[PDB]
Design an enzyme around this catalytic site. Structure first.
Site, short mmCIF file in Angstrom:
data_model
loop_
_atom_site.label_atom_id
_atom_site.label_comp_id
_atom_site.label_asym_id
_atom_site.label_seq_id
_atom_site.Cartn_x
_atom_site.Cartn_y
_atom_site.Cartn_z
N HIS A 1 0.80 -1.21 0.00
CA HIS A 1 0.00 0.00 0.00
C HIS A 1 0.84 1.27 0.00
O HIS A 1 1.51 1.59 0.98
CB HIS A 1 -0.95 -0.06 1.20
CG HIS A 1 -1.77 1.19 1.43
ND1 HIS A 1 -1.25 2.31 2.03
CD2 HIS A 1 -3.09 1.43 1.25
CE1 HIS A 1 -2.20 3.21 2.18
NE2 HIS A 1 -3.33 2.70 1.72
N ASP A 2 0.74 2.00 -1.11
CA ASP A 2 1.30 3.35 -1.27
C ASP A 2 2.78 3.46 -0.95
O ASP A 2 3.22 4.48 -0.41
CB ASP A 2 0.55 4.39 -0.43
CG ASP A 2 -0.90 4.62 -0.86
OD1 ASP A 2 -1.38 3.98 -1.82
OD2 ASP A 2 -1.57 5.48 -0.23
N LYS B 1 -5.03 4.61 -6.43
CA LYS B 1 -5.52 4.87 -5.08
C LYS B 1 -6.17 6.24 -5.04
O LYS B 1 -5.47 7.26 -5.20
CB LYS B 1 -4.31 4.83 -4.14
CG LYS B 1 -4.61 5.03 -2.69
CD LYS B 1 -5.41 3.86 -2.19
CE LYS B 1 -5.02 3.47 -0.80
NZ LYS B 1 -4.82 4.63 0.17
CA LIG Z 1 -2.10 6.54 3.98
#
Ligand SMILES: [Ca+2]
Ligand SMILES: CCCCCCCCO[C@@H]1O[C@H](CO)[C@@H](O)[C@H](O)[C@H]1O
Ligand SMILES: CCCCCCCCO[C@@H]1O[C@H](CO)[C@@H](O)[C@H](O)[C@H]1O
Ligand SMILES: [Ca+2]
Lengths: 205, 205
Positions: free
Chosen positions: A32-33, A116
């Site tokens: 994630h990211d 995202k």
């Molecule tokens: Ca975040």
């Protein structure tokens, strides 16, 4: 001076209320990211970043060997203001550069890359439909930042009947305090927290 | 002995990052899970419950006078195990009785009553579609418990481009600590925290 002061990744993790175990036939690894933009808020040569990256690398290698799909999320550059909506009131216009996934975690040819749009990776994305289509119902969650997108993604997953496994030493945050509170919240309310070590053992079965 | 020990509703609230103000033409008042079942975890004659109820009553009366729709959420009795899914691993089978909205907050004939399936009031409900159909894009949030369903509902609202206004002395929680952390999280990341007093002033315009 980095915006996020150096701190050590937690070794001690909160206890879980649930007895869930990662199953390679059921799981997906979410990274994630882990974009240059977000990592640059830290001194990347200082704790927790070198160990964070090593742990995610290890999880990714074990996931690959076990047949667990890997999915990345990344926030897009120059997000349209109308579309970005209320986020701008909390964070401003968003990133214009540094969108690349950090090189040590480079996506490979078969790894999915999702855009995202919100804190939760599920929002305005095909993530839920893909998990349901494939019958995968466990989501292993790594990346930054624990108390924001990691927590929000875990909440959505749990509410969508997907077991979240947040890797306690496979995420980082604005501070050790934010990081540890995030893990306590998750274990108590919305998923299982696992160490990188324990997740790798469950994966390899 | 109540499961939740008495504590005083916070008077001091965290500062907001956003300048949003409640607008009667845009807003909906959500009364979240104010069911007998959830209130009975407290001594209802002890703080924070009498003031909580007074505040929600006041907000509801002002909302009515201003033309703000009121929506209740309530968890259903004997939730089907398959449907309840992962919640049971955290909480057990769920409620079998005490499902009624507490009498002092009795829904009136025109107030919507939604079934609450998950932490977020949006999940498996028509809430988002109704807000979008009606053009209402502010959600005033009251009820219990701050760190769970209130926070999760606020997160979903914010990500769905609906401004959440969580009423700091119009919610309660498992403890003062959980309550205050919830408000800090919301102000910092996913909505505006307002006092009952301030919300009523903004409503009445
Ligand atoms: Ca975040
Ligand atoms: C303590 C200092 C650390 C500040 C990190 C700021 C990161 C700014 O970036 C923001 O992060 C948000 C939360 O993930 C995203 O939702 C936004 O899209 C992004 O613009
Ligand atoms: C500190 C003691 C307070 C415990 C309150 C337990 C409430 C049990 O109830 C549970 O609450 C959950 C969270 O809202 C819901 O999601 C569940 O559906 C419900 O079964
Ligand atoms: Ca709740």
């Amino acid at each position: 001076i980095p915006k996020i002061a150096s701190y050590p990744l937690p070794v001690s993790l909160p206890t879980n209320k649930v007895d869930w175990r990662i199953d390679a036939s059921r799981a997906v690894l979410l990274i994630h990211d882990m974009q240059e933009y977000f990592v640059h808020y830290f001194d990347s040569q200082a704790e927790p970043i070198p160990s964070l990256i090593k742990h995610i690398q290890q999880l990714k290698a074990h996931a690959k060997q076990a047949g667990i799909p890997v999915v990345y999320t990344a926030q897009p550059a120059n997000q349209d203001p109308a579309e970005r909506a209320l986020l701008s009131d909390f964070w401003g216009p968003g990133l214009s550069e540094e969108t690349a996934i950090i090189a040590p975690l480079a996506p490979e040819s078969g790894d999915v890359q999702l855009t995202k749009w919100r804190y939760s990776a599920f929002k305005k994305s095909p993530l839920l439909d893909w998990l349901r289509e494939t019958g995968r119902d466990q989501l292993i969650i790594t990346g930054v930042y624990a108390h924001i997108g990691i927590l929000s993604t875990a909440l959505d997953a749990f509410m969508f009947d997907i077991q979240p496994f947040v890797i306690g030493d496979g995420v980082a945050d604005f501070s050790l305090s934010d990081h540890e509170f995030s893990l306590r919240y998750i274990s108590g309310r919305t998923g299982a927290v696992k160490s990188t070590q324990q997740a790798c053992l469950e994966i390899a079965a």
